[PDB]
Amino acid sequence: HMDAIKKKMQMLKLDKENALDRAEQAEADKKAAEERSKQLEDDIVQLEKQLRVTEDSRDQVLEELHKSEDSLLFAEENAAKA
């Protein structure tokens, strides 16, 4: 009869629509994750920049410490020799 069939056909359309709604939701979550990733990536680039800059500054000051330390020693020596 046209009942059992029409109802089954309707159940099949319904089931498809539900799967489509599930895909829609997952897709929405995918894009939220992707946009967070983009923010994290920018954050990383920036913190990497800060790291390189800090490393190079650290090196400069370390080298300046040695020179100062040396100059101090030479000042003590010279005073003592005077």
Added chain:
Amino acid sequence: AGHMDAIKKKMQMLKLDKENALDRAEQAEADKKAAEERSKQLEDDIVQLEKQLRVTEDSRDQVLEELHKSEDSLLFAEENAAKA
């Protein structure tokens, strides 16, 4: 074939649309999990990078402090000579 053959071809068809949509829903769920796992990975990356940045900045501050102390000490010596 006018008859149930034609109406059976439809049923099959609707079964297909359903199967395809289910398939696509599964694949969408898989891409979502993948995108989120990429995010977690970058979070791990930033946690690690920040640890390295905190160490380097603390090290740099410690050397800089030491340097300022040494510099002041030397300057004293020099101002003393300059003033004599």
